[PDB]
Design a protein around this ligand. Structure first.
Ligand SMILES: Cc1cc2nc3c(=O)[nH]c(=O)nc-3n(C[C@H](O)[C@H](O)[C@H](O)COP(=O)(O)OP(=O)(O)OC[C@H]3O[C@@H](n4cnc5c(N)ncnc54)[C@H](O)[C@@H]3O)c2cc1C
Ligand SMILES: Cc1cc2nc3c(=O)[nH]c(=O)nc-3n(C[C@H](O)[C@H](O)[C@H](O)COP(=O)(O)OP(=O)(O)OC[C@H]3O[C@@H](n4cnc5c(N)ncnc54)[C@H](O)[C@@H]3O)c2cc1C
Lengths: 489, 483
């Protein structure tokens, strides 16, 4: 009364866990990890479904495997025990239109080839001063400038195909920033089997009594006497030499608004600095969501573990491109109810990569918010997705899906993410709207509220921004710093 | 004479064309060969079919100023000058067969990782880099991926015209600015530019053997036949490899120019840090197309061993890796790049690309058709097999439904003294920006350089030469107007 801790970490996602791991590795005693949920892991969450099949409903992949320090760490472990922690599941993308059917690897459409050109065209637009536009506006520039060297079908389907990027950002192409759109993936992705393995291993690397679940932090206060007071929901009070705040950027955002009775919101005294407050105007939050379709057994072609359905497109669009006089003129005549074919869906066929009869599919805002809201009405979900499911089975030498919630594929269960509605995540991760500069947030975050009040988390770091390993590295960064500072006695 | 231009390749021609367009009169283009075009040459074969035996593609078509200029004419008259023949590559191994877009091998995907890896690494050969990659990422590669990936990525040999052991890893990968456009044909482009300036400017079969800055501030050029010439400005566009003869004493070397004063050291030194690739071509003309037109792009992989995979897995490190490895030539000894012209052009021929050291060996026997056929017969049969046809029959002399080879054409760029190779390329330890900067600033105010080797954007490429020519002329033209 009040209990004195060396370091207090808020949030037990991967950033928080790694911070705690690092502090203990560094010999620091008497620390505490305060987590509002009843589980560790945060936006790493593995869930179980039909037949006890397991699925990562948060992050699934180790990305940038050539440099990903967290991935490398897993890999070194597997190299030593022979255990399977991940599988490389990069594959040839199957691309489907409702009408045309398969559209990938087409010797007429050559979509993947013009995609690479489209992308290289993008890279040549973004070398200082040049303003931001939506990724949509970017694709339209390309199509206009290159219409002479594109078939009508290329003009039609290419724009739909390049929108798989929506499922990497969790954002619609009209909402997505062209600048931050095309990013260099540093090597193949590795599918985690599963991520809870990663969370558990790190969780178990520090004192088990450091961990306090079901503990929502409500306020943090810098004492003029060079200490930090942390107040919890249940009236528990703590005093720390250092605090590392890892709550999602969206939750951290609640702080700069007046009304305090919001789940997750931390009251700051003195308030969060102007640089931190203003940085919120220049970075945003994506709604990447997941829907898991579990089937009795695989009754489809295992040609590929990567399937993308394209939203519908018109031949009328192609003529508008042919007939526009220039950009401004094209933007006008375009503006002159939502279904499954209204946007690109990314489907991961787990039967091929993991041997489980289930499709893990990804969706983006605004669809995600909508779909996560009705995540209780399973039959409405079935009807919504049924046309793209039947389409998929058809293009994979199978028949319509039968609602089982022979050789006909029978759906046994549907699982949906909840990241938008969960007060402790409030969306998927850091995303850029047109005009955004994520560098502002990273600089303000990595610089800290002050010497004692720090931040970590996916939204606080350049390399691996938005990714598990970025989060993981941010936590190590704050902790090694604090560890060094403390070691000076 | 206002300007004297050496070389009537695309650099020289555009330089001459640009001079006329800007109102400059009384110039002169000296060319050692009996034709214009330089390394742009279109030849005729069986049935009259035409082929670009030098350059055939407009590269970097998102930027490429010459390409845009061509497309602008085809938008004006609707006349086909090119075709986008970019396609999905079929990859063929002698033993396994087709190997592209395979669901278990995923070679193209690991190739993309390999390139990403090369990008991150930045002083060695492309071969060492690939080995370095496999050794580092072997935990994440299947056995067959280790076997076949290093063969697949050697497609890059047919870009630099250089074997992977001879090729610098630094200058190996590069980004194309978009799709390629197969030109139909380059001669159309050659003739268009050649005619855009007065034909009395042209002098053929005039080999230039000395260039001389008068201390009187003028340029004295003299030809092989003893003809003397006088000009204010001189634009030299001879290929790098020929220009490189100038740093040697011996005079009677075909093509070699005597400089007075000698080339500036920074030009002489720059030859240490860049060299020359040897891309060659072979054309295989068939009576009719009796094969699949699935792709216009086909690559055959040099042979690989499972013995090789075993070695990677067992190598404790890089030193040990070189040890195990070292520890005659055929058509399977190296990758080869075949273009199926039937799909893109309508012509029943394969245009095949080859690299040093194979190139000079095949060119040196270009006259011996039987030996050529026998040398290529195995890959050709393989190709037809993977393309739903039968073995090729030799119909090159006078005689069912099998493919009949009627003629074979081979390039000769390595034995031709006025090309002496294909285009500039990097050996390990080279740096092309030495040469490009030196050429850009010239020998003095009066002695200029143009050519594919004289410019950063489009180095080695036709549009590079074309823009280099535009630059020296557009500079010279500006100076003359000022009086
Ligand atoms: C759907 C989805 C898919 C993704 N896919 C990938 C992927 O494939 N690969 C990849 O690398 N990354 C992926 N990510 C991103 C990755 O999940 C995140 O970058 C990372 O998990 C975030 O870690 P963090 O510790 O920064 O945040 P979190 O783990 O979200 O935050 C840590 C903790 O803060 C807690 N908290 C919030 N408020 C309070 C409070 N008031 N008091 C106490 N605790 C609080 C939260 O409960 C949370 O547990 C994905 C994310 C989502 C949402
Ligand atoms: C097989 C092959 C394939 C190629 N493929 C492509 C391709 O697909 N796309 C592409 O862009 N590029 C390609 N290239 C390269 C391209 O051909 C060159 O970049 C370009 O043609 C060179 O232009 P240039 O005018 O600088 O040189 P050149 O045109 O070679 O030289 C100009 C003239 O200099 C003359 N000359 C030399 N010495 C003397 C002398 N002593 N006196 C008078 N004249 C002299 C030569 O006769 C020549 O006519 C290819 C080259 C080869 C060999």
């Amino acid at each position: 009364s009040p209990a004195k801790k060396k370091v207090i970490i808020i949030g037990a996602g991967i950033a928080g866990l790694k911070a705690a791991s690092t502090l203990h590795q560094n010999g620091i005693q008497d620390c505490l990890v305060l987590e509002a949920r009843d589980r560790v892991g945060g936006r790493l969450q593995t869930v179980t479904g039909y037949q006890g099949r397991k699925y990562d409903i948060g992050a699934s992949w180790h990305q940038d495997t050539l440099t990903n320090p967290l991935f490398l760490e897993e890999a070194q472990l597997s190299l030593n025990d022979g255990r399977t922690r991940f599988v490389f599941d990069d594959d040839n993308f199957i691309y489907i239109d409702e009408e045309r059917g398969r559209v990938d690897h087409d010797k007429e459409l050559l979509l993947e080839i013009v995609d690479n050109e489209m992308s290289k065209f993008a890279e040549l637009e973004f070398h200082l001063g040049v303003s931001d536009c939506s990724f949509f506006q970017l694709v339209m520039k390309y199509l206009l400038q290159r219409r002479q060297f594109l078939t009508n079908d290329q003009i039609r389907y290419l724009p739909q195909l390049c929108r798989y990027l929506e499922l990497w950002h969790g954002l619609d192409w009209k909402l997505l920033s062209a600048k931050d759109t095309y990013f260099g993936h540093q090597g193949r992705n590795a599918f985690a089997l599963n991520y809870d393995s990663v969370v558990q291993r790190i969780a178990q690397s520090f004192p088990q009594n450091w961990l306090k679940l079901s503990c929502e932090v409500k306020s943090i206060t810098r004492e003029p006497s060079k200490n930090v007071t942390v107040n919890c929901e249940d009236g528990t009070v703590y005093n720390a030499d250092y605090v590392i705040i890892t709550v999602p950027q969206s939750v951290l955002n609640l702080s700069v608004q007046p009304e305090k009775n919001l789940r997750g919101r931390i009251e700051f005294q003195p308030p969060l600095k102007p640089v931190i407050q203003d940085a919120f105007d220049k970075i945003h939050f994506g709604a990447l969501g997941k829907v898991i379709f579990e089937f009795e057994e695989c009754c489809w072609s295992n040609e590929s573990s990567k399937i993308v359905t394209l939203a519908n497109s018109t031949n009328e669009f192609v003529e508008i491109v042919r007939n526009a006089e220039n950009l401004d003129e094209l933007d006008s005549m375009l503006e002159r109810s939502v279904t499954c074919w209204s946007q690109p869906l990314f489907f991961v066929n787990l039967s091929k990569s993991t041997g489980v009869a289930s499709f893990m599919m990804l969706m983006q805002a605004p669809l995600t918010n909508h779909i996560e809201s009705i995540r209780e009405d399973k039959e409405r979900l079935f009807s919504f997705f049924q046309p793209v499911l039947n389409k998929i089975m058809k293009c994979l030498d199978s028949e319509d899906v039968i609602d089982g919630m022979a050789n006909k594929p029978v759906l046994r269960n549907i699982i949906v993410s909840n990241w938008t509605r969960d007060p402790y995540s409030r969306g998927a991760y850091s995303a850029c709207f047109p005009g955004d500069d994520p560098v502002d947030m990273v600089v303000a975050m990595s610089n800290g509220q002050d010497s004692r009040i720090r931040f970590a988390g996916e939204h606080t770091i350049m390399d691996g921004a938005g990714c598990a390993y970025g989060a993981w590295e941010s936590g190590r960064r704050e902790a090694t710093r604090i560890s060094d500072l403390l070691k000076l006695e």
